[PDB]
Amino acid sequence: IPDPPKHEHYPTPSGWQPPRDPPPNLPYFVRRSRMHNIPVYKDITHGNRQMTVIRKVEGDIWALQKDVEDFLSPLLGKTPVTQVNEVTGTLRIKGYFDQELKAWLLEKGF
Amino acid sequence: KNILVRMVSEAGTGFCFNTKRNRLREKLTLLHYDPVVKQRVLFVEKKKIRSL
Amino acid sequence: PVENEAVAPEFTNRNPRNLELLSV
Amino acid sequence: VTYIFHQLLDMREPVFEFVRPPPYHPKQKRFPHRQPLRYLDRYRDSHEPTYGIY
Amino acid sequence: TSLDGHLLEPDAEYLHWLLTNIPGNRVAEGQVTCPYLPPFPARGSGIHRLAFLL
Amino acid sequence: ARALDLLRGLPRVSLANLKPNPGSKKPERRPRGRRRGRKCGRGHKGERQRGTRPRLGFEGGQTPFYIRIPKYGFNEGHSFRRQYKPLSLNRLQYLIDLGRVDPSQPIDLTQLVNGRGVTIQPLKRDYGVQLVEEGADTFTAKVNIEVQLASELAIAAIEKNGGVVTTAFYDPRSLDIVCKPVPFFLRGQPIPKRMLPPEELVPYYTDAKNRGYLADPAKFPEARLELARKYGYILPDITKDELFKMLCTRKDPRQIFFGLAPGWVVNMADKKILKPTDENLLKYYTS
Amino acid sequence: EFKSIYSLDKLYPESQGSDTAWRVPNGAKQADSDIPLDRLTISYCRSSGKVNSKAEVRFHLATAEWIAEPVRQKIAITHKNKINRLGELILTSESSRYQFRNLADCLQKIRDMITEASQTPKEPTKEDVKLHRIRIENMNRERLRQKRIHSA
Amino acid sequence: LTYFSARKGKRKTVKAVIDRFLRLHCGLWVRRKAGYKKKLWKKTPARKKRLREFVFCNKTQSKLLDKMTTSFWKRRNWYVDDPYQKYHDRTNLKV
RNA sequence: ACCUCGGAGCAGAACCCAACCUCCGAGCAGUACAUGCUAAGACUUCACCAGUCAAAGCGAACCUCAAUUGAUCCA
Ligand SMILES: [Mg+2]
Ligand SMILES: [Mg+2]
Ligand SMILES: [Mg+2]
Ligand SMILES: [Mg+2]
Ligand SMILES: [Mg+2]
Ligand SMILES: [Mg+2]
Ligand SMILES: [Mg+2]
């Protein structure tokens, strides 16, 4: 797959933004996919369980977990019950939080 | 005792219904609603297919 | 701004002879 | 009333409308046992064929 | 005054005509204190009312 | 990171410490002993233990649920209906912005297959890919596209920026050819010609409001002006644009491709294309 | 380059030009009922997500040159409830979630209003569901009149 | 329903289920009330209207109809003029 | 002696409950076919198949009894 062409207005339509250059000094890092998309998906186990999984987590998982917890605390009022998985770059967050996490990772520097 | 017949309309052919009738009387000529005309036309007894 | 534009989104009516005059 | 609000109060004419509360509908179950086909249209937002990833 | 017409305070109301010191039947000799103002009912509102308090 | 620092020490990783991920390998249950013994988890005697049970749906002489209901024309001829995969303008703009669909060449079916935006199945009775007007707003592409089924709103939104919509029909053989042309070239058979639309699609593909490939080009500007007056926006003229010769690629029928010709055998090994000679072959391929 | 019997040029010999399908018929379709878009102020001030879009369009009705005087006066008299304080005709729709459908609906509304305002001999359908009580109240108010002289 | 055939070794379906029911992609089966075309002279018009309505199934019935079919009847079809297209997807679902 | 269904006490004041416990019955009827078409909400003979009431609109002048009955296929 070829690289996407550098547009003139980086606010490119249909919801897509390329990652910036020299990305910020953070202990963790979020990679991309083949289609240059933000790795924020949804998953369901049974018929009532709802959560989102960030499948690309490289670096310190605890820092990103604390960041997303502090970000989602004012949106729910409590503590989001997450799973700090270190063997894989995953981070399950209970509740439908897809576009919010996408916007947060786009405005942070990923 | 009774008998079931079918009434055919004069205006707008294609809509027919069934109604009871006595066996020792003559035919029927009542006023039934027609959906294709949205009014009231005449119905004539024609072709019996029941003998209850 | 005009100070007389205090309309508020909700308007109530204190007349019992009102609901039956509008067929409601 | 328009002329009054124009050349007597120096403001705009407010408008209203006798609104009604939305109708009541029970909680939409997963398997609506003994329900007509129009049961899904009772909770449907817009009456247009929506498309997701397609 | 108009019992129905106040847009801000629901319990309060507006003022239209007010007179004072009317020499008996002479309703044209007393001093004035409030200019007359025709009613201004809203469009979507109900049926307003105005009572003459003498 | 810390993983390499912890892996620097410790003994080597061979076939002596293969540890499977817990939760994936469940222990096998064996009906032997006291917990899973006696009846081996089969209950009491009878048909529930001997295994001689009726088929799925038998209620012991009672009329089952799937029998007391009369038949109805639900799936009468589902194996003959024409199915079309959806395609919204939002996803098209997304593919164009990502670069998988270049807006400089005419886009048909093989281009969409190569870009991998839609999955066209040769079987399951699929006669192409339709068009969806879900991505009407915020759609700036300006590129001609060949769609089998395009709605009025989608055609209008495409013509707003300066695009060309071409409605064409293809037989399932043409679909299989245009989906994967590499195995068709490796096959060894010449390129066949396009088949005429069925009896229930001639007035649809020969109409001006549908932008068909068989209608007269004298009624297209009238329909475009009508759509511009209906959906608003000033209709721009593409006769003054620099890409005028690219938008005029109406794709002549009996081609099922682009710049080739029906009857031209394509050979992958040794880049050479052979032209059919004689006269009966040419008369049949140009009929 | 390639062409067969069922080609576009052979099936229609009268249409063989390279630009016969792109020639905009602007010189033969410039009537007064086209509604100019340069003097219209179309704006979108709603983005619901009950997914419905709002397309509000307003224009100064008193300065419209593409509308004759009597039809303009008639459409201003019969539609005096949708005119803004500054003489702006505010017309909006709330049916579909797309802006194009709402704009087309607003254009169709404007067109039917224009074509019905000019046609004065129009038979009004007598309704009896909401105007009967109004007529009764008007008649009862007109009945209680029996003085002799009053000015003001 | 023959779990294992003698030639292909696959799973077979029941054509009666296909001819008498209609499965939607959401997981619902559309059926028809029996007796809606026979003996309509002794039934009230309300009963005649009630019998002519697309009634959904239950849970065990839907599970049975799914077990009687294979993976071909549980896909998603995109017909050109499908009157039941709006009933395939089911929105506004909260457990 | 019986093979379907309803009522009276057993089962007393929301509901359900059986007997080869004791009795009345029903496989219909006296009169107009708007006994037209759609559409919120419920009961449900202890499951299912089935049955019943009804907001509102277009259309029109201004329904009684307790059981009172028949599905798949096919013609
Ligand atoms: Mg999953
Ligand atoms: Mg034993
Ligand atoms: Mg036993
Ligand atoms: Mg046996
Ligand atoms: Mg039996
Ligand atoms: Mg029950
Ligand atoms: Mg009613």
Short mmCIF file of N, CA and C in Angstrom, two decimals, chain F residues 105-231:
data_model
loop_
_atom_site.label_atom_id
_atom_site.label_comp_id
_atom_site.label_asym_id
_atom_site.label_seq_id
_atom_site.Cartn_x
_atom_site.Cartn_y
_atom_site.Cartn_z
N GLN F 105 -7.73 8.73 -13.08
CA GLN F 105 -8.11 7.73 -14.06
C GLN F 105 -9.58 7.34 -13.87
N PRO F 106 -10.26 6.93 -14.94
CA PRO F 106 -11.65 6.50 -14.80
C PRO F 106 -11.77 5.29 -13.88
N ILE F 107 -12.69 5.39 -12.92
CA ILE F 107 -12.89 4.35 -11.91
C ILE F 107 -14.08 3.50 -12.32
N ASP F 108 -13.87 2.18 -12.41
CA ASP F 108 -14.93 1.25 -12.74
C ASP F 108 -15.04 0.17 -11.67
N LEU F 109 -14.94 -1.10 -12.06
CA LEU F 109 -14.99 -2.22 -11.13
C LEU F 109 -13.61 -2.76 -10.80
N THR F 110 -12.75 -2.94 -11.80
CA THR F 110 -11.41 -3.46 -11.55
C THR F 110 -10.59 -2.50 -10.70
N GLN F 111 -10.78 -1.19 -10.87
CA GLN F 111 -10.07 -0.23 -10.04
C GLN F 111 -10.52 -0.32 -8.58
N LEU F 112 -11.82 -0.51 -8.35
CA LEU F 112 -12.31 -0.68 -6.98
C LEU F 112 -11.85 -1.99 -6.38
N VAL F 113 -11.70 -3.04 -7.19
CA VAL F 113 -11.19 -4.31 -6.68
C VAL F 113 -9.72 -4.19 -6.32
N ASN F 114 -8.93 -3.51 -7.16
CA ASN F 114 -7.52 -3.31 -6.86
C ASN F 114 -7.33 -2.43 -5.63
N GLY F 115 -8.14 -1.38 -5.50
CA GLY F 115 -8.10 -0.55 -4.31
C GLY F 115 -8.65 -1.23 -3.07
N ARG F 116 -9.41 -2.31 -3.25
CA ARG F 116 -9.94 -3.11 -2.14
C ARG F 116 -10.82 -2.26 -1.22
N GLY F 117 -11.79 -1.58 -1.82
CA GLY F 117 -12.77 -0.82 -1.07
C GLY F 117 -14.07 -1.59 -0.91
N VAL F 118 -14.40 -2.39 -1.92
CA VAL F 118 -15.58 -3.24 -1.90
C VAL F 118 -15.18 -4.65 -2.30
N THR F 119 -15.93 -5.63 -1.81
CA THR F 119 -15.68 -7.04 -2.11
C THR F 119 -16.77 -7.53 -3.05
N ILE F 120 -16.42 -7.70 -4.32
CA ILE F 120 -17.36 -8.14 -5.35
C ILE F 120 -17.21 -9.65 -5.49
N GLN F 121 -18.26 -10.38 -5.13
CA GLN F 121 -18.24 -11.84 -5.23
C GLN F 121 -18.76 -12.27 -6.60
N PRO F 122 -18.00 -13.08 -7.34
CA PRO F 122 -18.50 -13.53 -8.66
C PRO F 122 -19.75 -14.39 -8.57
N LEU F 123 -19.92 -15.13 -7.48
CA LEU F 123 -21.09 -15.97 -7.28
C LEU F 123 -22.13 -15.22 -6.45
N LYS F 124 -23.05 -15.96 -5.83
CA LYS F 124 -24.11 -15.42 -4.99
C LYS F 124 -25.02 -14.45 -5.74
N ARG F 125 -25.01 -14.51 -7.08
CA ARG F 125 -25.84 -13.67 -7.94
C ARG F 125 -25.61 -12.18 -7.64
N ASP F 126 -24.45 -11.71 -8.11
CA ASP F 126 -24.05 -10.32 -7.96
C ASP F 126 -23.82 -9.73 -9.35
N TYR F 127 -24.53 -8.64 -9.65
CA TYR F 127 -24.47 -8.00 -10.96
C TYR F 127 -23.76 -6.66 -10.91
N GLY F 128 -22.88 -6.46 -9.93
CA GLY F 128 -22.09 -5.26 -9.82
C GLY F 128 -22.22 -4.64 -8.45
N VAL F 129 -21.85 -3.37 -8.36
CA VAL F 129 -21.86 -2.62 -7.11
C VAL F 129 -22.72 -1.37 -7.31
N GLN F 130 -23.67 -1.16 -6.40
CA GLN F 130 -24.54 0.00 -6.47
C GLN F 130 -23.87 1.21 -5.82
N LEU F 131 -24.59 2.33 -5.78
CA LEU F 131 -24.08 3.57 -5.22
C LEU F 131 -25.02 4.05 -4.12
N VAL F 132 -24.44 4.56 -3.04
CA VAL F 132 -25.19 5.03 -1.88
C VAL F 132 -24.89 6.51 -1.69
N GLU F 133 -25.94 7.30 -1.44
CA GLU F 133 -25.82 8.74 -1.22
C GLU F 133 -25.67 9.09 0.26
N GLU F 134 -25.11 8.19 1.06
CA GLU F 134 -24.96 8.47 2.49
C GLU F 134 -23.93 9.57 2.73
N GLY F 135 -22.88 9.62 1.92
CA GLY F 135 -21.87 10.64 2.07
C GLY F 135 -22.08 11.82 1.14
N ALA F 136 -23.25 12.44 1.22
CA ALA F 136 -23.56 13.57 0.34
C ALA F 136 -22.78 14.81 0.76
N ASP F 137 -22.93 15.22 2.02
CA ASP F 137 -22.24 16.41 2.51
C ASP F 137 -20.75 16.13 2.70
N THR F 138 -19.95 17.18 2.57
CA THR F 138 -18.49 17.12 2.70
C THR F 138 -17.90 16.07 1.77
N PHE F 139 -18.20 16.24 0.48
CA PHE F 139 -17.73 15.33 -0.57
C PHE F 139 -17.16 16.17 -1.71
N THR F 140 -15.84 16.29 -1.75
CA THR F 140 -15.13 17.03 -2.80
C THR F 140 -14.12 16.08 -3.44
N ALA F 141 -14.47 15.55 -4.61
CA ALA F 141 -13.60 14.61 -5.30
C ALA F 141 -13.42 14.99 -6.76
N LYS F 142 -14.54 15.22 -7.47
CA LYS F 142 -14.53 15.56 -8.88
C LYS F 142 -13.80 14.50 -9.70
N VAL F 143 -14.46 13.38 -9.96
CA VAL F 143 -13.86 12.28 -10.71
C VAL F 143 -14.99 11.42 -11.26
N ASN F 144 -14.83 10.99 -12.51
CA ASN F 144 -15.83 10.13 -13.13
C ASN F 144 -15.77 8.73 -12.52
N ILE F 145 -16.94 8.12 -12.36
CA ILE F 145 -17.06 6.79 -11.78
C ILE F 145 -18.16 6.03 -12.51
N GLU F 146 -17.93 4.75 -12.75
CA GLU F 146 -18.87 3.88 -13.45
C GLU F 146 -19.54 2.97 -12.42
N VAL F 147 -20.81 3.23 -12.15
CA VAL F 147 -21.58 2.47 -11.16
C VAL F 147 -22.75 1.80 -11.86
N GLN F 148 -23.06 0.57 -11.43
CA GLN F 148 -24.17 -0.16 -12.03
C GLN F 148 -25.51 0.44 -11.62
N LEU F 149 -25.64 0.84 -10.36
CA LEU F 149 -26.87 1.44 -9.85
C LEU F 149 -26.50 2.69 -9.06
N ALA F 150 -26.94 3.85 -9.55
CA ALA F 150 -26.67 5.13 -8.91
C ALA F 150 -27.98 5.87 -8.71
N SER F 151 -28.23 6.32 -7.48
CA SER F 151 -29.45 7.03 -7.16
C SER F 151 -29.38 8.47 -7.66
N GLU F 152 -30.52 9.17 -7.54
CA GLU F 152 -30.58 10.55 -8.00
C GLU F 152 -29.73 11.47 -7.14
N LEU F 153 -29.81 11.31 -5.81
CA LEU F 153 -29.03 12.15 -4.91
C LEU F 153 -27.53 11.94 -5.12
N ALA F 154 -27.11 10.69 -5.30
CA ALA F 154 -25.69 10.40 -5.50
C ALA F 154 -25.19 10.99 -6.81
N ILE F 155 -25.96 10.84 -7.89
CA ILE F 155 -25.57 11.41 -9.18
C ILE F 155 -25.49 12.93 -9.08
N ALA F 156 -26.46 13.55 -8.39
CA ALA F 156 -26.44 15.00 -8.22
C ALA F 156 -25.20 15.44 -7.45
N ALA F 157 -24.90 14.77 -6.33
CA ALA F 157 -23.74 15.14 -5.53
C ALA F 157 -22.44 14.93 -6.28
N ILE F 158 -22.38 13.92 -7.15
CA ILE F 158 -21.18 13.71 -7.96
C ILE F 158 -21.05 14.81 -9.01
N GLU F 159 -22.18 15.20 -9.62
CA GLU F 159 -22.14 16.24 -10.65
C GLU F 159 -21.93 17.63 -10.07
N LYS F 160 -22.14 17.81 -8.76
CA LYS F 160 -21.90 19.12 -8.15
C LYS F 160 -20.43 19.51 -8.25
N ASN F 161 -19.53 18.59 -7.90
CA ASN F 161 -18.10 18.88 -7.97
C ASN F 161 -17.57 18.83 -9.40
N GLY F 162 -18.22 18.06 -10.27
CA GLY F 162 -17.78 17.95 -11.65
C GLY F 162 -17.43 16.54 -12.06
N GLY F 163 -18.25 15.57 -11.65
CA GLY F 163 -18.03 14.18 -11.96
C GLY F 163 -19.00 13.67 -13.02
N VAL F 164 -18.69 12.48 -13.53
CA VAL F 164 -19.48 11.82 -14.56
C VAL F 164 -19.91 10.46 -14.04
N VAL F 165 -21.21 10.19 -14.09
CA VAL F 165 -21.77 8.92 -13.65
C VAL F 165 -22.19 8.13 -14.89
N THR F 166 -21.71 6.89 -14.99
CA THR F 166 -22.01 6.02 -16.12
C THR F 166 -22.67 4.75 -15.60
N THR F 167 -23.92 4.53 -16.00
CA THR F 167 -24.67 3.34 -15.59
C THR F 167 -24.52 2.26 -16.66
N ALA F 168 -23.91 1.14 -16.28
CA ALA F 168 -23.66 0.04 -17.20
C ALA F 168 -24.10 -1.27 -16.57
N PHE F 169 -24.35 -2.26 -17.43
CA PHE F 169 -24.76 -3.59 -17.01
C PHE F 169 -23.77 -4.62 -17.54
N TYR F 170 -23.52 -5.66 -16.75
CA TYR F 170 -22.59 -6.71 -17.12
C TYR F 170 -23.13 -8.06 -16.65
N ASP F 171 -22.94 -9.08 -17.48
CA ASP F 171 -23.32 -10.43 -17.10
C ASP F 171 -22.36 -10.97 -16.05
N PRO F 172 -22.77 -11.99 -15.29
CA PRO F 172 -21.87 -12.57 -14.27
C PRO F 172 -20.52 -13.00 -14.81
N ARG F 173 -20.45 -13.43 -16.08
CA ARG F 173 -19.16 -13.73 -16.68
C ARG F 173 -18.29 -12.48 -16.76
N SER F 174 -18.87 -11.36 -17.18
CA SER F 174 -18.12 -10.11 -17.20
C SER F 174 -17.71 -9.67 -15.80
N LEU F 175 -18.56 -9.93 -14.80
CA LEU F 175 -18.19 -9.63 -13.42
C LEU F 175 -16.98 -10.45 -12.99
N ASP F 176 -17.00 -11.76 -13.27
CA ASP F 176 -15.86 -12.60 -12.92
C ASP F 176 -14.60 -12.19 -13.67
N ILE F 177 -14.75 -11.71 -14.90
CA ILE F 177 -13.59 -11.28 -15.67
C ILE F 177 -13.01 -9.99 -15.09
N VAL F 178 -13.87 -9.03 -14.77
CA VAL F 178 -13.40 -7.72 -14.30
C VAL F 178 -12.94 -7.76 -12.85
N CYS F 179 -13.40 -8.73 -12.06
CA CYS F 179 -12.95 -8.82 -10.67
C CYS F 179 -11.47 -9.19 -10.59
N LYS F 180 -11.11 -10.35 -11.13
CA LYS F 180 -9.73 -10.83 -11.13
C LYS F 180 -9.29 -11.05 -12.57
N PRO F 181 -8.68 -10.05 -13.20
CA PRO F 181 -8.26 -10.22 -14.61
C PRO F 181 -7.00 -11.04 -14.79
N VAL F 182 -6.19 -11.21 -13.75
CA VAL F 182 -4.93 -11.95 -13.86
C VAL F 182 -5.20 -13.43 -14.11
N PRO F 183 -6.10 -14.10 -13.37
CA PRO F 183 -6.41 -15.49 -13.73
C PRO F 183 -7.14 -15.60 -15.06
N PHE F 184 -7.90 -14.58 -15.46
CA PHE F 184 -8.53 -14.61 -16.77
C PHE F 184 -7.48 -14.55 -17.88
N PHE F 185 -6.40 -13.80 -17.66
CA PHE F 185 -5.32 -13.76 -18.64
C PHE F 185 -4.50 -15.05 -18.61
N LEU F 186 -4.30 -15.62 -17.42
CA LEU F 186 -3.61 -16.90 -17.30
C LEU F 186 -4.46 -18.07 -17.76
N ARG F 187 -5.75 -17.86 -18.03
CA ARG F 187 -6.62 -18.94 -18.46
C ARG F 187 -6.21 -19.46 -19.84
N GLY F 188 -6.28 -18.60 -20.85
CA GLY F 188 -5.91 -18.98 -22.20
C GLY F 188 -7.04 -18.82 -23.20
N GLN F 189 -8.16 -18.25 -22.74
CA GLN F 189 -9.32 -18.03 -23.60
C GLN F 189 -9.38 -16.57 -24.04
N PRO F 190 -9.87 -16.32 -25.25
CA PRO F 190 -9.98 -14.93 -25.73
C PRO F 190 -11.04 -14.16 -24.96
N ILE F 191 -10.94 -12.83 -25.07
CA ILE F 191 -11.85 -11.93 -24.37
C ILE F 191 -13.21 -11.95 -25.07
N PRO F 192 -14.27 -12.36 -24.39
CA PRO F 192 -15.60 -12.37 -25.01
C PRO F 192 -16.18 -10.96 -25.07
N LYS F 193 -17.38 -10.86 -25.64
CA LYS F 193 -18.07 -9.59 -25.78
C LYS F 193 -19.15 -9.45 -24.71
N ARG F 194 -19.60 -8.21 -24.52
CA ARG F 194 -20.60 -7.92 -23.51
C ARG F 194 -21.97 -8.45 -23.94
N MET F 195 -22.77 -8.84 -22.95
CA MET F 195 -24.12 -9.33 -23.19
C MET F 195 -25.14 -8.23 -22.97
N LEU F 196 -26.24 -8.30 -23.72
CA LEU F 196 -27.27 -7.28 -23.62
C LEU F 196 -28.03 -7.42 -22.30
N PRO F 197 -28.52 -6.32 -21.75
CA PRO F 197 -29.30 -6.38 -20.50
C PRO F 197 -30.58 -7.17 -20.70
N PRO F 198 -31.16 -7.70 -19.62
CA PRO F 198 -32.40 -8.49 -19.76
C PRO F 198 -33.59 -7.64 -20.15
N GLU F 199 -34.77 -8.26 -20.23
CA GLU F 199 -35.96 -7.56 -20.69
C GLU F 199 -36.46 -6.55 -19.66
N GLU F 200 -36.18 -6.78 -18.38
CA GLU F 200 -36.65 -5.92 -17.30
C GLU F 200 -35.65 -4.83 -16.93
N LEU F 201 -34.66 -4.57 -17.78
CA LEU F 201 -33.67 -3.53 -17.52
C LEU F 201 -33.40 -2.63 -18.71
N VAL F 202 -34.02 -2.90 -19.87
CA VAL F 202 -33.80 -2.04 -21.04
C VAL F 202 -34.31 -0.62 -20.81
N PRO F 203 -35.54 -0.39 -20.33
CA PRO F 203 -35.97 1.00 -20.09
C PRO F 203 -35.22 1.67 -18.96
N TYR F 204 -34.56 0.91 -18.09
CA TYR F 204 -33.78 1.51 -17.01
C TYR F 204 -32.39 1.92 -17.49
N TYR F 205 -31.75 1.09 -18.31
CA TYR F 205 -30.42 1.39 -18.82
C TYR F 205 -30.44 2.24 -20.09
N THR F 206 -31.61 2.46 -20.69
CA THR F 206 -31.74 3.32 -21.86
C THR F 206 -32.42 4.64 -21.52
N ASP F 207 -32.43 5.03 -20.25
CA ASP F 207 -33.06 6.26 -19.81
C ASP F 207 -32.00 7.34 -19.59
N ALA F 208 -32.45 8.60 -19.63
CA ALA F 208 -31.56 9.73 -19.45
C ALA F 208 -31.37 10.11 -17.99
N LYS F 209 -32.40 9.95 -17.16
CA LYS F 209 -32.28 10.29 -15.75
C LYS F 209 -31.43 9.29 -14.98
N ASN F 210 -31.18 8.12 -15.54
CA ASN F 210 -30.36 7.10 -14.90
C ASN F 210 -28.93 7.08 -15.41
N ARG F 211 -28.60 7.91 -16.40
CA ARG F 211 -27.25 8.01 -16.96
C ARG F 211 -26.78 6.66 -17.51
N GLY F 212 -27.67 5.97 -18.23
CA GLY F 212 -27.32 4.69 -18.80
C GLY F 212 -26.31 4.80 -19.92
N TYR F 213 -25.71 3.66 -20.25
CA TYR F 213 -24.70 3.59 -21.30
C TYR F 213 -25.29 3.36 -22.68
N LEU F 214 -26.60 3.19 -22.79
CA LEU F 214 -27.26 2.99 -24.07
C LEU F 214 -28.19 4.13 -24.46
N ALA F 215 -28.42 5.10 -23.57
CA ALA F 215 -29.29 6.21 -23.89
C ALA F 215 -28.59 7.20 -24.81
N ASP F 216 -29.39 8.06 -25.44
CA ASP F 216 -28.84 9.05 -26.35
C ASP F 216 -28.16 10.18 -25.57
N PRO F 217 -27.02 10.67 -26.04
CA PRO F 217 -26.33 11.76 -25.33
C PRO F 217 -26.96 13.13 -25.50
N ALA F 218 -28.11 13.22 -26.18
CA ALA F 218 -28.77 14.50 -26.38
C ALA F 218 -29.68 14.89 -25.22
N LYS F 219 -30.02 13.95 -24.35
CA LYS F 219 -30.89 14.21 -23.21
C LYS F 219 -30.14 14.28 -21.89
N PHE F 220 -28.81 14.08 -21.90
CA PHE F 220 -28.04 14.19 -20.67
C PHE F 220 -27.98 15.62 -20.14
N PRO F 221 -27.68 16.65 -20.94
CA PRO F 221 -27.64 18.01 -20.37
C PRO F 221 -28.98 18.47 -19.83
N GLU F 222 -30.09 18.04 -20.43
CA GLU F 222 -31.40 18.40 -19.89
C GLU F 222 -31.61 17.82 -18.50
N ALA F 223 -31.27 16.54 -18.32
CA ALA F 223 -31.40 15.92 -17.01
C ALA F 223 -30.45 16.55 -16.00
N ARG F 224 -29.24 16.91 -16.43
CA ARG F 224 -28.30 17.56 -15.52
C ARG F 224 -28.81 18.93 -15.09
N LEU F 225 -29.39 19.69 -16.02
CA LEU F 225 -29.97 20.99 -15.66
C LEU F 225 -31.16 20.82 -14.73
N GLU F 226 -31.98 19.80 -14.96
CA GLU F 226 -33.11 19.54 -14.07
C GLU F 226 -32.63 19.20 -12.66
N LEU F 227 -31.59 18.36 -12.56
CA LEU F 227 -31.06 18.01 -11.24
C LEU F 227 -30.43 19.22 -10.57
N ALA F 228 -29.77 20.09 -11.34
CA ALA F 228 -29.18 21.30 -10.77
C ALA F 228 -30.26 22.25 -10.27
N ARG F 229 -31.37 22.36 -10.99
CA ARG F 229 -32.47 23.21 -10.53
C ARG F 229 -33.18 22.61 -9.33
N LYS F 230 -33.22 21.28 -9.24
CA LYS F 230 -33.90 20.63 -8.12
C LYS F 230 -33.08 20.71 -6.84
N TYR F 231 -31.85 20.20 -6.88
CA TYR F 231 -30.98 20.14 -5.71
C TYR F 231 -30.15 21.40 -5.52
#
